[PDB]
Each structure stands twice: as C-alpha cells, then as structure tokens.
C-alpha cells in the first residue's frame, strides 16, 4: 500500500539522518576521508528518498487523496531545499571551505527539523 511505501521511504530518510550525524562527527574530528565516503552514501540515500517520495505523491494523486497530495507537495518542496543545501555542502567540501560547510550543515539540520511535523502528518493522511 501507499502507507507501507511511506513507512519504507521514512526509514530510508532516517538512515540518512543517522549517516548525517556520523558524518558531522567525522567533520568535527577532521577525518576528511570518512566525510567524503559519508557524503557519497548520503547522496545515494537522498536520491532514493526523492524517488520514493515522488512515487507516493504520484499514487496519492491517482487515488484522488487531495489532503495527502497537498501535504506531499509541501513536503517535497521542502525536500528540494534540503537537497540544495546538501549539494552546496558537497561543493564546499570539494573546495575546502570549512566555514561554508559548517554553515550549510546547520542549515540542513534546521530545515530537516522543521519539516518533521509535516512528515508525521503525511503518515496519517495517506
């Protein structure tokens, strides 16, 4: 069901959260070879999550679930903000700009924390 596909999508999202928090530690400790791997692992996790969210949204549209569609449109628009911050963070790592990498990391935490009451609302609306 769409609801189980959402639970699967949310788990993928939570793995990203876990790897992020590990990555952040590695950044603080100055372990760049670890950061590089975690950034690659997060990239593949975020691409997967984006694909599952687009399918959930498309299925809710085909099902005519107008509330779920509304909430998913808002939640995916936030997702595109988080991914933009993530990509810029990746570029700051390539460039060796630790000041920006710190700035982009905290922004991604706040944008993610904010978009959490909506994530719960979608679990109930589907």
Short mmCIF file of N, CA and C in Angstrom, two decimals:
data_model
loop_
_atom_site.label_atom_id
_atom_site.label_comp_id
_atom_site.label_asym_id
_atom_site.label_seq_id
_atom_site.Cartn_x
_atom_site.Cartn_y
_atom_site.Cartn_z
N UNK A 1 0.83 -1.23 0.00
CA UNK A 1 0.00 0.00 0.00
C UNK A 1 0.86 1.26 0.00
N UNK A 2 0.22 2.40 -0.31
CA UNK A 2 0.92 3.68 -0.24
C UNK A 2 1.43 3.91 1.17
N UNK A 3 0.68 3.45 2.18
CA UNK A 3 1.10 3.69 3.55
C UNK A 3 2.38 2.94 3.88
N UNK A 4 2.49 1.69 3.41
CA UNK A 4 3.71 0.92 3.64
C UNK A 4 4.88 1.47 2.83
N UNK A 5 4.62 1.91 1.59
CA UNK A 5 5.65 2.59 0.82
C UNK A 5 6.11 3.86 1.53
N UNK A 6 5.22 4.54 2.25
CA UNK A 6 5.66 5.69 3.04
C UNK A 6 6.54 5.25 4.21
N UNK A 7 6.17 4.17 4.90
CA UNK A 7 6.99 3.70 6.01
C UNK A 7 8.38 3.32 5.51
N UNK A 8 8.46 2.68 4.34
CA UNK A 8 9.74 2.36 3.74
C UNK A 8 10.53 3.62 3.39
N UNK A 9 9.86 4.61 2.79
CA UNK A 9 10.50 5.89 2.48
C UNK A 9 11.00 6.58 3.75
N UNK A 10 10.18 6.59 4.81
CA UNK A 10 10.60 7.25 6.05
C UNK A 10 11.81 6.56 6.68
N UNK A 11 11.90 5.24 6.55
CA UNK A 11 13.07 4.54 7.07
C UNK A 11 14.32 4.97 6.31
N UNK A 12 14.24 4.98 4.98
CA UNK A 12 15.36 5.46 4.18
C UNK A 12 15.77 6.86 4.63
N UNK A 13 14.79 7.75 4.82
CA UNK A 13 15.09 9.08 5.36
C UNK A 13 15.83 9.03 6.68
N UNK A 14 15.43 8.12 7.58
CA UNK A 14 16.04 8.07 8.91
C UNK A 14 17.45 7.51 8.87
N UNK A 15 17.72 6.61 7.93
CA UNK A 15 19.10 6.19 7.73
C UNK A 15 19.96 7.37 7.33
N UNK A 16 19.47 8.18 6.39
CA UNK A 16 20.20 9.39 6.02
C UNK A 16 20.48 10.22 7.26
N UNK A 17 19.48 10.41 8.12
CA UNK A 17 19.70 11.17 9.35
C UNK A 17 20.85 10.59 10.16
N UNK A 18 20.89 9.27 10.29
CA UNK A 18 21.93 8.61 11.07
C UNK A 18 23.30 8.83 10.43
N UNK A 19 23.41 8.60 9.12
CA UNK A 19 24.70 8.79 8.47
C UNK A 19 25.12 10.26 8.54
N UNK A 20 24.17 11.18 8.39
CA UNK A 20 24.48 12.60 8.55
C UNK A 20 25.13 12.86 9.89
N UNK A 21 24.51 12.40 10.97
CA UNK A 21 25.05 12.71 12.29
C UNK A 21 26.42 12.09 12.48
N UNK A 22 26.67 10.92 11.89
CA UNK A 22 28.01 10.34 11.90
C UNK A 22 28.97 11.22 11.10
N UNK A 23 28.56 11.61 9.90
CA UNK A 23 29.38 12.47 9.06
C UNK A 23 29.79 13.74 9.80
N UNK A 24 28.81 14.41 10.43
CA UNK A 24 29.08 15.64 11.18
C UNK A 24 30.18 15.41 12.20
N UNK A 25 30.09 14.33 12.98
CA UNK A 25 31.16 13.98 13.90
C UNK A 25 32.50 13.90 13.17
N UNK A 26 32.54 13.15 12.07
CA UNK A 26 33.79 12.97 11.33
C UNK A 26 34.32 14.31 10.85
N UNK A 27 33.44 15.21 10.40
CA UNK A 27 33.86 16.55 10.01
C UNK A 27 34.49 17.27 11.20
N UNK A 28 33.83 17.23 12.36
CA UNK A 28 34.37 17.94 13.51
C UNK A 28 35.75 17.41 13.85
N UNK A 29 35.92 16.09 13.77
CA UNK A 29 37.20 15.45 14.09
C UNK A 29 38.24 15.62 12.99
N UNK A 30 37.89 16.23 11.86
CA UNK A 30 38.82 16.43 10.77
C UNK A 30 39.17 15.22 9.94
N UNK A 31 38.30 14.19 9.93
CA UNK A 31 38.53 12.94 9.20
C UNK A 31 37.89 13.09 7.82
N UNK A 32 38.63 13.72 6.91
CA UNK A 32 38.10 14.06 5.60
C UNK A 32 37.83 12.82 4.74
N UNK A 33 38.65 11.78 4.85
CA UNK A 33 38.40 10.59 4.04
C UNK A 33 37.09 9.92 4.44
N UNK A 34 36.74 9.99 5.72
CA UNK A 34 35.44 9.48 6.15
C UNK A 34 34.32 10.39 5.65
N UNK A 35 34.46 11.70 5.85
CA UNK A 35 33.45 12.62 5.35
C UNK A 35 33.16 12.36 3.88
N UNK A 36 34.19 12.20 3.07
CA UNK A 36 33.96 12.00 1.65
C UNK A 36 33.08 10.79 1.40
N UNK A 37 33.34 9.68 2.10
CA UNK A 37 32.53 8.49 1.91
C UNK A 37 31.10 8.72 2.39
N UNK A 38 30.94 9.28 3.59
CA UNK A 38 29.59 9.58 4.08
C UNK A 38 28.81 10.50 3.12
N UNK A 39 29.46 11.50 2.52
CA UNK A 39 28.76 12.36 1.56
C UNK A 39 28.28 11.56 0.35
N UNK A 40 29.08 10.59 -0.11
CA UNK A 40 28.65 9.72 -1.21
C UNK A 40 27.50 8.81 -0.78
N UNK A 41 27.55 8.31 0.45
CA UNK A 41 26.49 7.45 0.95
C UNK A 41 25.19 8.23 1.13
N UNK A 42 25.28 9.44 1.69
CA UNK A 42 24.11 10.30 1.80
C UNK A 42 23.55 10.64 0.43
N UNK A 43 24.41 10.87 -0.57
CA UNK A 43 23.90 11.26 -1.87
C UNK A 43 23.00 10.17 -2.42
N UNK A 44 23.45 8.93 -2.32
CA UNK A 44 22.65 7.82 -2.82
C UNK A 44 21.40 7.61 -1.99
N UNK A 45 21.46 7.89 -0.69
CA UNK A 45 20.27 7.80 0.16
C UNK A 45 19.25 8.88 -0.20
N UNK A 46 19.70 10.12 -0.42
CA UNK A 46 18.78 11.20 -0.75
C UNK A 46 18.15 11.02 -2.12
N UNK A 47 18.90 10.49 -3.08
CA UNK A 47 18.33 10.22 -4.40
C UNK A 47 17.24 9.15 -4.30
N UNK A 48 17.49 8.10 -3.51
CA UNK A 48 16.49 7.07 -3.31
C UNK A 48 15.25 7.65 -2.64
N UNK A 49 15.44 8.46 -1.61
CA UNK A 49 14.30 9.02 -0.89
C UNK A 49 13.48 9.92 -1.80
N UNK A 50 14.16 10.73 -2.62
CA UNK A 50 13.45 11.58 -3.56
C UNK A 50 12.59 10.76 -4.52
N UNK A 51 13.10 9.61 -4.95
CA UNK A 51 12.35 8.78 -5.90
C UNK A 51 11.14 8.15 -5.23
N UNK A 52 11.28 7.69 -3.99
CA UNK A 52 10.14 7.10 -3.30
C UNK A 52 9.09 8.16 -3.01
N UNK A 53 9.50 9.37 -2.62
CA UNK A 53 8.52 10.41 -2.35
C UNK A 53 7.78 10.82 -3.62
N UNK A 54 8.45 10.82 -4.77
CA UNK A 54 7.74 11.18 -5.99
C UNK A 54 6.69 10.13 -6.35
N UNK A 55 6.97 8.86 -6.05
CA UNK A 55 6.02 7.78 -6.34
C UNK A 55 4.82 7.82 -5.39
N UNK A 56 5.07 8.04 -4.11
CA UNK A 56 4.00 8.21 -3.15
C UNK A 56 3.11 9.35 -3.57
N UNK A 57 3.70 10.47 -3.98
CA UNK A 57 2.92 11.62 -4.41
C UNK A 57 2.10 11.28 -5.66
N UNK A 58 2.72 10.61 -6.62
CA UNK A 58 2.00 10.25 -7.84
C UNK A 58 0.85 9.29 -7.54
N UNK A 59 1.05 8.35 -6.62
CA UNK A 59 -0.02 7.40 -6.26
C UNK A 59 -1.15 8.11 -5.53
N UNK A 60 -0.82 9.03 -4.63
CA UNK A 60 -1.88 9.78 -3.95
C UNK A 60 -2.68 10.62 -4.93
N UNK A 61 -2.03 11.14 -5.97
CA UNK A 61 -2.74 11.89 -7.00
C UNK A 61 -3.68 10.98 -7.77
N UNK A 62 -3.21 9.80 -8.16
CA UNK A 62 -4.05 8.86 -8.90
C UNK A 62 -5.21 8.37 -8.05
N UNK A 63 -5.03 8.29 -6.73
CA UNK A 63 -6.06 7.90 -5.77
C UNK A 63 -7.00 9.03 -5.41
N UNK A 64 -6.73 10.25 -5.86
CA UNK A 64 -7.56 11.40 -5.54
C UNK A 64 -7.52 11.80 -4.07
N UNK A 65 -6.44 11.50 -3.37
CA UNK A 65 -6.35 11.79 -1.94
C UNK A 65 -5.86 13.23 -1.82
N UNK A 66 -6.81 14.17 -1.84
CA UNK A 66 -6.46 15.58 -2.01
C UNK A 66 -5.65 16.12 -0.85
N UNK A 67 -5.94 15.67 0.38
CA UNK A 67 -5.17 16.13 1.53
C UNK A 67 -3.75 15.59 1.47
N UNK A 68 -3.60 14.31 1.18
CA UNK A 68 -2.26 13.73 1.08
C UNK A 68 -1.45 14.42 -0.01
N UNK A 69 -2.08 14.73 -1.14
CA UNK A 69 -1.39 15.43 -2.22
C UNK A 69 -0.90 16.79 -1.74
N UNK A 70 -1.76 17.55 -1.09
CA UNK A 70 -1.37 18.88 -0.59
C UNK A 70 -0.16 18.79 0.33
N UNK A 71 -0.24 17.93 1.34
CA UNK A 71 0.85 17.77 2.30
C UNK A 71 2.12 17.28 1.60
N UNK A 72 2.01 16.34 0.67
CA UNK A 72 3.18 15.83 -0.05
C UNK A 72 3.78 16.90 -0.96
N UNK A 73 2.96 17.74 -1.60
CA UNK A 73 3.52 18.84 -2.36
C UNK A 73 4.33 19.75 -1.47
N UNK A 74 3.83 20.07 -0.27
CA UNK A 74 4.59 20.94 0.62
C UNK A 74 5.87 20.24 1.08
N UNK A 75 5.78 18.95 1.38
CA UNK A 75 6.91 18.21 1.93
C UNK A 75 8.00 18.01 0.89
N UNK A 76 7.62 17.77 -0.36
CA UNK A 76 8.62 17.63 -1.42
C UNK A 76 9.29 18.96 -1.75
N UNK A 77 8.55 20.07 -1.69
CA UNK A 77 9.18 21.37 -1.92
C UNK A 77 10.24 21.65 -0.86
N UNK A 78 9.98 21.28 0.39
CA UNK A 78 11.00 21.37 1.44
C UNK A 78 12.17 20.43 1.13
N UNK A 79 11.87 19.22 0.66
CA UNK A 79 12.93 18.29 0.29
C UNK A 79 13.89 18.92 -0.71
N UNK A 80 13.36 19.65 -1.69
CA UNK A 80 14.23 20.26 -2.69
C UNK A 80 15.12 21.34 -2.08
N UNK A 81 14.68 21.98 -0.99
CA UNK A 81 15.52 22.93 -0.26
C UNK A 81 16.64 22.20 0.47
N UNK A 82 16.31 21.09 1.13
CA UNK A 82 17.33 20.34 1.84
C UNK A 82 18.39 19.82 0.90
N UNK A 83 17.97 19.33 -0.27
CA UNK A 83 18.90 18.80 -1.25
C UNK A 83 19.78 19.90 -1.83
N UNK A 84 19.22 21.09 -2.02
CA UNK A 84 20.05 22.21 -2.48
C UNK A 84 21.12 22.56 -1.46
N UNK A 85 20.77 22.58 -0.18
CA UNK A 85 21.76 22.82 0.86
C UNK A 85 22.77 21.69 0.90
N UNK A 86 22.33 20.45 0.71
CA UNK A 86 23.25 19.33 0.72
C UNK A 86 24.25 19.45 -0.42
N UNK A 87 23.77 19.73 -1.63
CA UNK A 87 24.67 19.84 -2.77
C UNK A 87 25.68 20.96 -2.57
N UNK A 88 25.24 22.10 -2.04
CA UNK A 88 26.19 23.18 -1.79
C UNK A 88 27.22 22.76 -0.75
N UNK A 89 26.78 22.02 0.26
CA UNK A 89 27.70 21.48 1.25
C UNK A 89 28.73 20.59 0.58
N UNK A 90 28.30 19.76 -0.37
CA UNK A 90 29.22 18.91 -1.11
C UNK A 90 30.24 19.76 -1.85
N UNK A 91 29.79 20.83 -2.47
CA UNK A 91 30.71 21.71 -3.18
C UNK A 91 31.67 22.39 -2.22
N UNK A 92 31.20 22.80 -1.04
CA UNK A 92 32.11 23.39 -0.06
C UNK A 92 33.16 22.40 0.40
N UNK A 93 32.82 21.12 0.49
CA UNK A 93 33.81 20.13 0.86
C UNK A 93 34.85 19.97 -0.23
N UNK A 94 34.41 19.87 -1.48
CA UNK A 94 35.35 19.81 -2.60
C UNK A 94 36.31 20.98 -2.55
N UNK A 95 35.79 22.19 -2.31
CA UNK A 95 36.57 23.41 -2.37
C UNK A 95 37.40 23.63 -1.13
N UNK A 96 37.27 22.82 -0.09
CA UNK A 96 37.99 23.07 1.15
C UNK A 96 37.52 24.25 1.98
N UNK A 97 36.26 24.65 1.87
CA UNK A 97 35.69 25.79 2.58
C UNK A 97 34.95 25.24 3.81
N UNK A 98 35.68 25.11 4.92
CA UNK A 98 35.08 24.58 6.14
C UNK A 98 34.08 25.55 6.76
N UNK A 99 34.31 26.86 6.61
CA UNK A 99 33.34 27.83 7.12
C UNK A 99 31.97 27.64 6.47
N UNK A 100 31.93 27.50 5.15
CA UNK A 100 30.66 27.25 4.48
C UNK A 100 30.11 25.88 4.85
N UNK A 101 30.97 24.86 4.90
CA UNK A 101 30.48 23.52 5.22
C UNK A 101 29.77 23.50 6.57
N UNK A 102 30.34 24.16 7.57
CA UNK A 102 29.64 24.35 8.83
C UNK A 102 28.31 25.07 8.61
N UNK A 103 28.31 26.15 7.83
CA UNK A 103 27.09 26.93 7.63
C UNK A 103 26.02 26.09 6.93
N UNK A 104 26.41 25.35 5.90
CA UNK A 104 25.44 24.54 5.19
C UNK A 104 24.95 23.36 6.03
N UNK A 105 25.79 22.84 6.93
CA UNK A 105 25.41 21.69 7.75
C UNK A 105 24.32 22.07 8.76
N UNK A 106 24.49 23.20 9.45
CA UNK A 106 23.49 23.66 10.41
C UNK A 106 22.18 24.01 9.71
N UNK A 107 22.27 24.60 8.52
CA UNK A 107 21.06 24.92 7.76
C UNK A 107 20.29 23.66 7.41
N UNK A 108 21.00 22.60 7.02
CA UNK A 108 20.34 21.34 6.70
C UNK A 108 19.69 20.71 7.93
N UNK A 109 20.30 20.88 9.11
CA UNK A 109 19.68 20.37 10.34
C UNK A 109 18.37 21.09 10.63
N UNK A 110 18.37 22.42 10.54
CA UNK A 110 17.18 23.19 10.86
C UNK A 110 16.08 22.92 9.84
N UNK A 111 16.42 22.93 8.55
CA UNK A 111 15.42 22.68 7.52
C UNK A 111 14.81 21.29 7.69
N UNK A 112 15.62 20.32 8.14
CA UNK A 112 15.13 18.97 8.35
C UNK A 112 14.28 18.88 9.61
N UNK A 113 14.75 19.48 10.71
CA UNK A 113 13.96 19.51 11.93
C UNK A 113 12.60 20.16 11.68
N UNK A 114 12.58 21.28 10.95
CA UNK A 114 11.31 21.95 10.67
C UNK A 114 10.35 21.02 9.94
N UNK A 115 10.83 20.37 8.88
CA UNK A 115 9.98 19.52 8.08
C UNK A 115 9.73 18.16 8.70
N UNK A 116 9.44 18.14 10.00
CA UNK A 116 9.15 16.88 10.68
C UNK A 116 7.72 16.75 11.16
N UNK A 117 7.08 17.83 11.58
CA UNK A 117 5.66 17.72 11.90
C UNK A 117 4.84 17.42 10.65
N UNK A 118 5.29 17.91 9.49
CA UNK A 118 4.62 17.58 8.24
C UNK A 118 4.80 16.10 7.90
N UNK A 119 6.02 15.58 8.09
CA UNK A 119 6.28 14.17 7.80
C UNK A 119 5.34 13.27 8.61
N UNK A 120 5.08 13.63 9.87
CA UNK A 120 4.12 12.86 10.65
C UNK A 120 2.71 13.04 10.13
N UNK A 121 2.35 14.26 9.70
CA UNK A 121 1.00 14.48 9.18
C UNK A 121 0.75 13.65 7.93
N UNK A 122 1.78 13.43 7.11
CA UNK A 122 1.61 12.64 5.89
C UNK A 122 1.38 11.17 6.23
N UNK A 123 2.05 10.68 7.27
CA UNK A 123 1.85 9.29 7.66
C UNK A 123 0.39 9.01 7.99
N UNK A 124 -0.32 10.00 8.52
CA UNK A 124 -1.70 9.84 8.94
C UNK A 124 -2.71 10.11 7.83
N UNK A 125 -2.31 10.85 6.80
CA UNK A 125 -3.25 11.27 5.77
C UNK A 125 -3.36 10.27 4.63
N UNK A 126 -2.35 9.43 4.43
CA UNK A 126 -2.32 8.54 3.26
C UNK A 126 -3.38 7.46 3.27
#
